Amino acid sequence: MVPISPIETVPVKLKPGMDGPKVKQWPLTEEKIKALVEICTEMEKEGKISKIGPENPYNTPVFAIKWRKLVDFRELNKRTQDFWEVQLGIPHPAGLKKKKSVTVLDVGDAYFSVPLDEDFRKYTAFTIPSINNETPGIRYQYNVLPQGWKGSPAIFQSSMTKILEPFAAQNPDIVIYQYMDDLYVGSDLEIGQHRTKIEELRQHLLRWGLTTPDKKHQKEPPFLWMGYELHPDKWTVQPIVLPEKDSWTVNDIQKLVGKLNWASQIYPGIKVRQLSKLLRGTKALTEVIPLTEEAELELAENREILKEPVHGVYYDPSKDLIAEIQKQGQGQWTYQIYQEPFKNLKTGKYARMRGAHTNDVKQLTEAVQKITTESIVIWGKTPKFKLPIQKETWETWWTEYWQATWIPEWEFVNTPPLVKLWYQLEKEPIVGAETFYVDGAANRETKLGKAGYVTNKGRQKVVPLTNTTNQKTELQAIYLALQDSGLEVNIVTDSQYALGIIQAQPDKSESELVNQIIEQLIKKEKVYLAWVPAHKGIGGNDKLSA
Amino acid sequence: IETVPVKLKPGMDGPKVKQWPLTEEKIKALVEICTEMEKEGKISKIGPENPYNTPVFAIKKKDSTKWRKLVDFRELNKRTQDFPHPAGLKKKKSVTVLDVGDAYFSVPLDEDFRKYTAFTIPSINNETPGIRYQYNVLPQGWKGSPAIFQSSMTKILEPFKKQNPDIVIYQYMDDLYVGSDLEIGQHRTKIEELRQHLLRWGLEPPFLWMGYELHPDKWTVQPIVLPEKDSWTVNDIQKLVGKLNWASQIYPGIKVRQLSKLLRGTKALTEVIPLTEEAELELAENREILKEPVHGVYYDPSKDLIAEIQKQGQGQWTYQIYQEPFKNLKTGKYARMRGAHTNDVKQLTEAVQKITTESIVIWGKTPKFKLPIQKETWETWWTEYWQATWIPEWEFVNTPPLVKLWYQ
Ligand SMILES: Cc1cc(/C=C/C#N)cc(C)c1Nc1ccnc(Nc2ccc(C#N)cc2)n1
Numbered sequence: 025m026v027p028i029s030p031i032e033t034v035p036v037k038l039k040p041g042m043d044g045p046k047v048k049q050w051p052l053t054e055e056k057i058k059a060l061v062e063i064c065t066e067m068e069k070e071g072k073i074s075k076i077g078p079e080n081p082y083n084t085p086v087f088a089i090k091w092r093k094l095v096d097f098r099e100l101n102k103r104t105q106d107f108w109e110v111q112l113g114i115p116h117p118a119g120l121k122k123k124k125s126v127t128v129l130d131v132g133d134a135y136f137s138v139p140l141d142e143d144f145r146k147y148t149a150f151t152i153p154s155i156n157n158e159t160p161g162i163r164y165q166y167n168v169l170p171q172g173w174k175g176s177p178a179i180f181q182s183s184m185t186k187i188l189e190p191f192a193a194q195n196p197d198i199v200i201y202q203y204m205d206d207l208y209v210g211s212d213l214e215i216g217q218h219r220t221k222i223e224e225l226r227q228h229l230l231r232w233g234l235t236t237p238d239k240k241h242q243k244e245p246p247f248l249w250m251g252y253e254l255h256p257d258k259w260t261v262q263p264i265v266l267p268e269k270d271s272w273t274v275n276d277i278q279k280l281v282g283k284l285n286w287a288s289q290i291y292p293g294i295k296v297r298q299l300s301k302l303l304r305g306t307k308a309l310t311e312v313i314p315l316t317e318e319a320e321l322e323l324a325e326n327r328e329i330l331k332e333p334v335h336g337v338y339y340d341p342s343k344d345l346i347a348e349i350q351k352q353g354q355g356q357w358t359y360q361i362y363q364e365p366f367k368n369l370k371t372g373k374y375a376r377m378r379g380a381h382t383n384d385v386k387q388l389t390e391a392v393q394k395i396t397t398e399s400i401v402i403w404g405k406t407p408k409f410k411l412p413i414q415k416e417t418w419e420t421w422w423t424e425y426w427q428a429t430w431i432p433e434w435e436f437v438n439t440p441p442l443v444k445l446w447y448q449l450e451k452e453p454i455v456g457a458e459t460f461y462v463d464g465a466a467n468r469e470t471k472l473g474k475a476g477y478v479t480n481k482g483r484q485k486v487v488p489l490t491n492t493t494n495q496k497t498e499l500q501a502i503y504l505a506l507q508d509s510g511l512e513v514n515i516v517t518d519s520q521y522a523l524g525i526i527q528a529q530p531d532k533s534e535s536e537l538v539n540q541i542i543e544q545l546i547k548k549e550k551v552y553l554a555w556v557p558a559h560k561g562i563g564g565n566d567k568l569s570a
Numbered sequence: 571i572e573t574v575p576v577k578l579k580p581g582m583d584g585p586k587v588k589q590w591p592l593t594e595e596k597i598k599a600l601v602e603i604c605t606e607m608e609k610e611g612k613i614s615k616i617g618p619e620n621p622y623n624t625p626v627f628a629i630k631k632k633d634s635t636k637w638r639k640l641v642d643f644r645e646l647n648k649r650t651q652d653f654p655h656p657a658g659l660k661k662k663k664s665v666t667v668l669d670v671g672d673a674y675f676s677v678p679l680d681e682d683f684r685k686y687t688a689f690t691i692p693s694i695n696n697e698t699p700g701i702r703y704q705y706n707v708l709p710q711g712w713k714g715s716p717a718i719f720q721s722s723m724t725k726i727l728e729p730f731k732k733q734n735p736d737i738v739i740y741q742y743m744d745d746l747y748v749g750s751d752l753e754i755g756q757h758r759t760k761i762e763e764l765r766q767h768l769l770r771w772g773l774e775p776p777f778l779w780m781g782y783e784l785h786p787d788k789w790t791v792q793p794i795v796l797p798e799k800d801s802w803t804v805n806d807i808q809k810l811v812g813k814l815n816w817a818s819q820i821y822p823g824i825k826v827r828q829l830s831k832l833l834r835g836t837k838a839l840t841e842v843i844p845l846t847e848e849a850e851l852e853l854a855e856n857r858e859i860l861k862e863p864v865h866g867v868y869y870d871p872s873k874d875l876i877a878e879i880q881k882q883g884q885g886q887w888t889y890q891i892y893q894e895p896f897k898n899l900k901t902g903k904y905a906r907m908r909g910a911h912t913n914d915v916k917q918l919t920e921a922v923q924k925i926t927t928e929s930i931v932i933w934g935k936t937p938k939f940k941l942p943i944q945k946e947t948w949e950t951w952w953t954e955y956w957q958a959t960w961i962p963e964w965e966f967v968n969t970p971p972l973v974k975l976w977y978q
Contacts, residue, residue, distance in 0.1 A: 119695030178618040404594030428914035564836035
C-alpha cells in the first residue's frame with residue numbers, strides 16, 4: 025500500500041456556554057428502520073460513521089425520505105460556533121480572464137476523506153429506532169463532516185484549498201476554482217500541455233488518496249453558474265424571460281424587478297424606477313396593483329432591451345478600463361464599463377438616494393463612487409471615466425461647494441442630457457439691485473401665517489396663509505421676493521432653515537415650494553441672499569407676525 | 571519572552587469587521603509583506619474555526635517609497651480590556667516623530683488572544699480564497715501593544731534619558747515623539763543618537779531611519795477678530811451683527827444693540843452707513859472682550875475630544891477642537907494642503923492627520939472628527955492619501971454649518 029498524507033482536522037467548539045443537542049428521535053415505520061439500518065451499515069463499512077455505546081448523552085433526529093437518510097442537524101447547528109465563510113464574495117464574470125480550455129474534475133469522493141474533529145464527534149450522535157421498540161436503538165456518531173452540519177462547507181473548502189495551494193503556486197499558468205463537488209481548471213496552454221497539467225493535478229490529489237473519475241465530466245462549456253452563462257471568451261446572464269400578464273401582483277412585480285436588476289449587469293439601459301414605485305410602503309404579497317402609464321412604458325422599454333441576447337467580454341489586464349455614465353431621468357443613471365469600444369465587460373445602474381433635496385451633480389458624483397468601488401472589487405483598479413458634464417461645470421461646482429468632493433480621472437463626453445448647474449448665487453451684494461427684506465411666521469395651533477417683504481424702494485407685500493408652518497412661511501417669503509423682483513435682486517432673510525437648503529444647491533426637491541423657488545432662481549440673472557439673526561432690531565427685517 | 575495574559579471586555583466577542591476592497595498594488599504589497607512576516611514567525615496562517623476579522627491595507631509613510639502594512643484595529647481596540655501626559659512636549663521648539671512600531675514584534679502575544687487579531691488578504695474579484703492570518707506577536711496599531719511593551723521601552727530609553735534630562739520623550743501607539751528646545755542641527759543628531767541607541771537593542775527596522783519634524787512652539791492661539799473699516803455698508807454691518815451674535819454664545823458680554831440700531835430702516839445693502847458714537851463704542855467694547863480668553867475652559871481626560879473642520883475654499887481649512895460646545899480647547903487654520911491643489915479629499919485627509927497629530931502632542935489622544943464630506947466619498951478615497959500609522963474615529967456632516975462664515 026502507498027502511504028498517503030492525512031488531512032489535518034479542524035478543531036471545532038460549541039458556542040460559549042452551550043452544550044450539545046439532546047433531541048428526541050421521532051418514531052419510524054418498520055419499513056423506514058430497515059432502510060436506515062442497511063444504509064448505516066454501508067456507511068459504517070465506508071468508515072463515515074461508528075457505532076457508539078450508551079454513555080453518549082447527545083442526540084440528533086434521523087429521518088427516512090422516499091429510501092434516503094436525512095439527519096436533521098438544525099439543533100446542533102444552532103449550538104455550533106461560527107466559522108469563516110470564504111464564499112461570501114463571489115467572482116463577477118466581468119473580472120475573469122478568457123481561457124482556451126476549462127476542464128472539470130469531480131472531487132465528490134474527496135469530501136469524505138475530510139475527518140471531523142475527534143472531540144466534536146460525540147455531538148453528532150444519532151439513533152436508529154429499534155423494530156417495535158423492543159431493543160435499544162442502534163447508536164452512531166460521525167467520523168467525517170456530516171451533510172447538513174453548519175461547519176461542513178467551510179471546513180471542506182479550507183481543507184481542499186490547503187491541498188491545492190502548492191499546486192496552484194507551482195503552476196501559475198493555470199487557474200483553479202472550486203464549486204460544489206467540482207474543480208474547474210482553466211489555462212491558455214496548448215491543448216497537450218493543458219491535459220498534461222490536468223493529469224499532474226490528478227497525481228497531486230492522489231497524494232492525499234483523493235481519486236477522480238477517469239471517465240470525463242459531462243459538464244463542458246458553456247457553464248451554468250450562479251445565474252450566469254460562462255463561455256471560453258464571453259459571458260452573459262442566463263435567459264431573462266418577462267412573463268405576459270393581464271394583472272400584476274405585489275409578488276409578481278418584486279420578481280420582475282429582481283430579474284431586471286439581474287439583467288441590468290449586462291443589458292444596457294434597464295430601468296426599474298416606475299416599477300419599483302408600485303412597491304412603495306406596502307408589503308401584502310397577494311395585493312394586485314394597476315400599472316401606471318409610466319410603469320407600462322418602462323416595462324415596454326425593458327422588453328425591447330431584452331429582445332435578444334447580449335454578452336459581455338472578459339477582462340484584459342493589459343488595457344485600461346473605461347466607465348461611461350448617462351443620466352436617464354427621475355434620479356436614474358446607467359453606465360457601461362469597457363476596454364474596447366462596443367465591447368462591454370459589464371453594465372449597471374444607479375438610483376438617486378431617498379431625501380428631501382438633491383441635484384444632478386451630487387447624483388453623478390455618487391454614481392462615480394459606486395462604480396469606483398465596484399471596479400476595485402472586480403478589477404482592483406479605478407476606471408477612466410467618461411461623463412456627461414463639462415469640465416468647467418465640474419470646476420465651478422467643487423470649488424464652490426461647502427463639502428469636500430472628488431471625482432477621479434475623467435473626460436467630458438458630449439452626449440445629452442448634459443449635467444449642468446442651473447443657478448449660481450452671488451458672493452457679494454449687487455449694486456443697483458433692489459433689496460428685499462423678507463419674513464414669515466405662523467401660529468402653531470391654528471396653523472395660520474403670513475409671509476412678505478419690504479424693500480429699499482418702498483415695495484411691500486404681506487400674504488395671509490392657511491395650513492402652514494414657520495418654515496413654510498419663511499420659504500414663501502423668499503418666493504414672493506423672487507416673484508416680484510427684477511432680474512437682479514438682493515434678498516435678506518433670518519431663516520436658518522432656508523439658508524441650509526439653498527446652500528445645499530438643490531436643483532430638485534420633494535417640496536413643491538422649494539421647486540418653485542428653484543424655478544425662480546433659474547430665471548434670475550443675479551441673486552444675492554444675505555442672512556441676519558432674528559429679533560435683534562435689524563432694519564426692514566417681521567412685525568407685519570401680527 | 572513570557573506573555574502577558576490579555577482579555578476582551580466583559581460580555582464582548584472579538585471583531586468581525588469586513589475587509590474593504592483593495593487595489594491590486596496594495597494586495598501585492600501586502601502579499602509580499604505578510605509572506606516575509608510569516609517566515610519571521612510574526613504571523614501564522616489560520617483555519618475556518620476562526621471567524622474573527624480586522625481590515626488591513628497598506629500605505630506609504632511621508633517621504634518614502636516602501637509600503638507599510640496598516641491594520642485597522644479600531645474595533646478590536648474598543649473591545650480590548652483596559653490596561654500622565656507630559657505638558658512640556660507641546661512647548662518644545664522641535665519634535666521629531668519616529669516610527670518605532672517594529673519594536674513590538676519582539677514580544678510574543680498571549681496564545682489565547684491571538685485569534686482576535688485575525689485578518690484577510692483579499693484577492694482581486696475574489697477569484698482565489700483570501701489569505702487568512704493571525705498575529706503571534708504584539709501587532710502595530712493595537713492599543714495593547716504600547717501597554718505591554720511599556721516596561722521594555724522605559725528600560726531601553728533610560729540611559730538616553732539620564733544623559734539627556736531635558737529631552738521629552740512621549741510614546742503614542744507606534745509613534746515616538748522626541749522634543750527638545752535648541753538649534754535644529756544638534757536636534758537631528760540627538761534623534762540620530764537616539765536611533766543608534768535603539769538599533770543596538772534590536773541587535774532591521776524598515777522605517778526607523780525616518781524623521782517627521784514638528785515645531786509645536788510655533789503653534790498658538792487663533793482668536794476672534796472683527797474688521798477695521800472706515801466705510802461700513804448695510805451688508806457689512808449685518809455680517810458684523812451676525813458674527814457678534816454668534817460670538818455672544820462664547821463670550822458673555824457681547825452687545826449688538828447699538829450696532830443693530832444702525833440697521834434700522836429699509837436700506838439698500840450696498841449703501842454706506844456712518845457709525846454713530848454709540849455704535850463705535852459698542853464695537854470697541856466688543857473688540858476688547860474678544861481679546862480675553864473664553865471663561866470656564868478646561869480639559870477633562872475622561873471626555874472625548876471633538877474636532878470640526880470647515881472647507882473655506884482656495885485650499886484653506888479651518889478647524890476647532892472642543893469637549894463642550896462653545897468651549898474650544900484649540901482652533902486653527904491651514905492655508906497650504908500641499909499636493910492636493912485640485913483634490914479636496916486629499917486636502918481633507920491631510921488636515922485630519924495634521925489635527926490628530928496636534929491632538930496627540932497636546933492631550934495624548936485622538937479626537938472624534940466631524941467631516942464635511944459625504945460618507946461614501948470619504949470611505950472610497952481616504953486610504954489613498956493616508957500616511958499615519960494610527961486612525962481616528964469620524965462622523966459625517968450633511969448639513970452646511972452657518973459657522974463657516976465666522977471662522978473665515
Ligand atoms: C471563478 C471561476 C468560476 C468558474 C465557474 C465554473 C462553473 N460552473 C470557473 C473558473 C475556472 C473560475 N476561475 C477563473 C479565474 C480566472 N479566470 C477565469 N476565466 C474563465 C472561466 C470560465 C470560462 C468558461 N467557459 C472562461 C474563462 N476563471
